[PDB]
Amino acid sequence: RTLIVTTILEEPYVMYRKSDKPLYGNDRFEGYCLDLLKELSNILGFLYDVKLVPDGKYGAQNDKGEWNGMVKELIDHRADLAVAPLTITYVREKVIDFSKPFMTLGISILYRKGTPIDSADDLAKQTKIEYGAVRDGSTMTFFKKSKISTYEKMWAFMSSRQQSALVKNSDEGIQRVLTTDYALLMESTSIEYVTQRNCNLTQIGGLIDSKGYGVGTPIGSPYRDKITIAILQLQEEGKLHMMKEKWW
Amino acid sequence: RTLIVTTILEEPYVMYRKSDKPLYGNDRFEGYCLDLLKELSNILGFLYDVKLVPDGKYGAQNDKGEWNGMVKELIDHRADLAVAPLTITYVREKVIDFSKPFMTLGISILYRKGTPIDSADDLAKQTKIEYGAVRDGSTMTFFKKSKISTYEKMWAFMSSRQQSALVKNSDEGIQRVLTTDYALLMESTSIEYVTQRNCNLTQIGGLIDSKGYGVGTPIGSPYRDKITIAILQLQEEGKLHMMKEKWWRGNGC
Numbered sequence: 001r002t003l004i005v006t007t008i009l010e011e012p013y014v015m016y017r018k019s020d021k022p023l024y025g026n027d028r029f030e031g032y033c034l035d036l037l038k039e040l041s042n043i044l045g046f047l048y049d050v051k052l053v054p055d056g057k058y059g060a061q062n063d064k065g066e067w068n069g070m071v072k073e074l075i076d077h078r079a080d081l082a083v084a085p086l087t088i089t090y091v092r093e094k095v096i097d098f099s100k101p102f103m104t105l106g107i108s109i110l111y112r113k114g115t116p117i118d119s120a121d122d123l124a125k126q127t128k129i130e131y132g133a134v135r136d137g138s139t140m141t142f143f144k145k146s147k148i149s150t151y152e153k154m155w156a157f158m159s160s161r162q163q164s165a166l167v168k169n170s171d172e173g174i175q176r177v178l179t180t181d182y183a184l185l186m187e188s189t190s191i192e193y194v195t196q197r198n199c200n201l202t203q204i205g206g207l208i209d210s211k212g213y214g215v216g217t218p219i220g221s222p223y224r225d226k227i228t229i230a231i232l233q234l235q236e237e238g239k240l241h242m243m244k245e246k247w248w
Numbered sequence: 249r250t251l252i253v254t255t256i257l258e259e260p261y262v263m264y265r266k267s268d269k270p271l272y273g274n275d276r277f278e279g280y281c282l283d284l285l286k287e288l289s290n291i292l293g294f295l296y297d298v299k300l301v302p303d304g305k306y307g308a309q310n311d312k313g314e315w316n317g318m319v320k321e322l323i324d325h326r327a328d329l330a331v332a333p334l335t336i337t338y339v340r341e342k343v344i345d346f347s348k349p350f351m352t353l354g355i356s357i358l359y360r361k362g363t364p365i366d367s368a369d370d371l372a373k374q375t376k377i378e379y380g381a382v383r384d385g386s387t388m389t390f391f392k393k394s395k396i397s398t399y400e401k402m403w404a405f406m407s408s409r410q411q412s413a414l415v416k417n418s419d420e421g422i423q424r425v426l427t428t429d430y431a432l433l434m435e436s437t438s439i440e441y442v443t444q445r446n447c448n449l450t451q452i453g454g455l456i457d458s459k460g461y462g463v464g465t466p467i468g469s470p471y472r473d474k475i476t477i478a479i480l481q482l483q484e485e486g487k488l489h490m491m492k493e494k495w496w497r498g499n500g501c
């Protein structure tokens with residue numbers, strides 16, 4: 001049986017291929033996740049239809065506790081797998097089963113080069129330089145729930161003034177960093193990608209936490225473990241590292 | 249019901265406490281893993297008896313496909329959990345269920361300071377400097393199964409001459425590095441611990457792979473997921489990071 005794979009567009013994980021004529025099916029996409037997906041499909045032996053998540057969201061829960069995006073697709077069994085830079089979080093792992101991480105990363109700071117700023121603490125102590133994150137993303141949630149003083153303070157600032165310091169998506173954040181005096185709290189894997197394509201930007205400090213991206217499956221899914229094992233196999237033989245180098 | 253926790257002695261994960269009189273039970277140990285364990289027990293609400301694995305091995309399989317150590321304890325249901333720097337590997341994950349990693353790391357190089365060597369490649373190209381790893385550990389296995397040229401070459405050297413380049417345990421490896429012209433392939437978390445207490449030693453290059461340590465449970469265990477969720481919780485609130493700092497920090501160099 002063909003597995004339905006729910007995903008979302010995000011450089012360089014899942015992107016529309018470049019072609020002179022209209023593309024159809026899986027042929028529409030390319031990227032690290034499509035490469036990962038075909039590696040997993042060879043190892044486990046399954047066919048799949050990549051399908052973009054209808055609402056274009058990763059998955060968060062509203063005030064009433066209902067989920068949206070890819071997480072929701074898995075919960076309602078509208079998809080068998082979720083392959084994308086879907087951060088393994090406490091709140092998400094309770095409603096869906098994650099495979100072991102296929103990429104590890106952390107929350108860090110994207111800012112422009114040649115400045116005295118060097119840590120999340122430097123930012124927390126002032127207000128001249130504005131800073132924030134993608135609204136409702138795992139990074140924002142981290143700062144929202146943290147009880148570490150420095151992070152509590154930063155959240156106080158990010159959420160103030162109607163969350164004007166937050167951005168809707170990564171691209172809006174990057175442009176905001178390139179144009180104004182703004183710093184973006186962003187996942188390290190994404191910062192590496194960006195700083196490699198824009199010499200004006202750089203990472204500030206190191207990681208302020210350790211996270212991973214995993215393949216999502218519905219709770220009780222028989223593939224969860226098979227995928228985990230395949231990921232470990234791909235990691236141990238250098239394929240994951242090879243794939244990262246290819247797209248980064 | 250009290251859960252039986254199988255573990256092994258390894259600084260600074262599980263160590264014998266220092267005391268004037270004989271110690272008994274869980275009171276015998278201290279370390280990062282005992283701290284982790286009590287955090288998990290508070291969150292999940294269970295009691296536990298720490299018990300050192302009888303044969304003192306982590307878990308590898310012999311030629312007949314038989315497992316030993318902690319992995320074996322879990323397979324035969326002699327323990328409910330395995331809490332130790334037990335590397336999550338392909339071969340192990342097939343016989344036991346692992347929680348999500350509570351610590352991520354990689355294979356790196358422990359060598360002495362002030363030398364021209366700077367990468368696994370530098371080592372692979374020569375033979376003056378001897379190098380190896382703990383025999384039968386996950387690191388050795390990595391090199392044994394790799395098909396990457398540089399690692400294939402290093403394995404060729406490590407396994408040659410009856411594996412004389414390999415060591416029985418981390419301490420033998422560290423002493424060998426401090427005394428002779430030898431480099432030790434070792435997990436990054438352990439290198440950090442050592443270099444912080446030995447200003448003569450240092451890490452060479454970065455990580456040559458990405459691994460994690462996880463709590464082990466028997467296949468089909470009802471705790472696997474509960475523990476995973478608790479670990480994510482502890483990570484998200486800074487406790488795992490806090491615990492690492494508590495046991496890793498040295499006295500400066």
Ligand SMILES: C/C(=C/C=C/[C@@H](C)C(=O)O)[C@H]1CN[C@H](C(=O)O)[C@H]1CC(=O)O
Pocket residue numbers: 010056057058059060069085086087134135136137138139140169170185186187
């Ligand atoms: C790039 C990104 C955007 C998320 C946007 C959310 C608000 C959504 O549209 O559902 C994701 C990638 N991984 C994080 C997550 O899974 O939450 C998030 C980025 C981040 O939060 O740093």
Ligand SMILES: C/C(=C/C=C/[C@@H](C)C(=O)O)[C@H]1CN[C@H](C(=O)O)[C@H]1CC(=O)O
Pocket residue numbers: 258304305306307308317333334335381382383384385386387388417418433434435
């Ligand atoms: C310090 C260590 C010693 C393992 C010794 C094996 C040969 C044993 O006696 O069971 C462990 C720590 N994590 C690895 C593992 O889980 O296999 C191994 C060290 C390593 O292989 O680099």
